[PDB]
Design a protein around this ligand. Structure first.
Ligand SMILES: CC1=Cc2cc3[nH]c(cc4nc(cc5[nH]c(cc1n2)cc5C)C(C)=C4CCC(=O)O)c(CCC(=O)O)c3C
Length: 225
């Protein structure tokens, strides 16, 4: 039957979208898919898309069931430093990308330690020493909850495709428009209409050293990003 065919299609995005618009039957199939695939080991975009598509329906019973079954979301919230990533997950699950961006900024300082937490900005050497595990968790959350549109991994791949020229990267990801830097916070696009790689933001006020160290970090290759 048609719904079963759609289940097999889990192109993944098209089936998921169709199933979600097909009432209780379609939504049941999506819920069963999560039950069979969560918690994720590796990030799988289809699973992120099923969860987020269901969240986006904004229906009490679905949302309540998701919170009950998956109170911490679909991806293990692991940290080499014991950091709490649930508020980041919650902001992303609500598609509140502006809050998610603020939390990510705060969490990176927390990850770097007392000094960064106090000054509220990073040195490139702190970024180089970040544990891979935390960067993987943070990136996975952004990626899984944005249909792969957001994440440092996404920016890194665009940077690689720009010959590592940051001046070519900024317009691609919407951080500069010609000679004009995008102005924080109102100039940015806090939704999925934003260009690929738009979030999370890396303030350029202190130069590109932090961003470059982040994109060169071993985590991306290590975890297959
Ligand atoms: C080239 C350039 C200069 C510049 C000048 C500033 N940006 C700021 C703040 C910020 N700019 C941001 C993002 C970006 N700025 C970009 C380019 C530039 N911004 C590009 C992006 C994605 C973000 C996220 C903040 C808030 C966090 C923070 O204060 O560090 C602030 C206020 C910072 C402060 O008062 O501490 C200034 C002066």
């Amino acid at each position: 039957d048609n719904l079963t065919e759609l289940s097999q299609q889990l192109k993944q995005l098209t089936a998921i979208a169709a199933l979600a618009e097909m009432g209780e039957g379609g939504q049941g199939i999506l819920l069963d898919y999560l039950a069979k695939n969560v918690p994720l080991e590796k990030p799988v975009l289809a699973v992120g898309n099923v969860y987020q598509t269901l969240r986006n329906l904004e229906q009490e019973t679905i949302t309540t069931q998701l919170q009950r079954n998956y109170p911490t979301g679909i991806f293990p919230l692991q940290s080499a430093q014991g950091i709490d990533y649930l508020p980041l997950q919650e902001a992303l699950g609500s598609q509140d990308f502006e809050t998610a961006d603020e939390i990510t900024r705060d969490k990176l300082c927390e990850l770097a330690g007392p000094g960064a937490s106090q000054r509220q900005w990073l040195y490139f050497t702190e970024v180089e020493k970040f544990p891979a595990l935390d960067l993987h968790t943070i990136n996975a959350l952004w990626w899984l909850h944005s249909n792969g549109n957001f994440g440092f991994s996404v920016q890194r791949r665009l940077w690689l495709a720009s010959g590592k020229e940051f001046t070519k990267l900024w317009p691609k990801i919407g951080w500069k428009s010609g000679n004009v830097w995008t102005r924080w916070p109102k100039g940015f696009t806090w939704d999925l209409s934003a260009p690929q790689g738009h979030l999370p933001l890396l303030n350029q006020l202190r130069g590109v050293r932090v961003a470059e160290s982040l994109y060169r970090h071993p985590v991306w290759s290590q975890y297959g990003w």
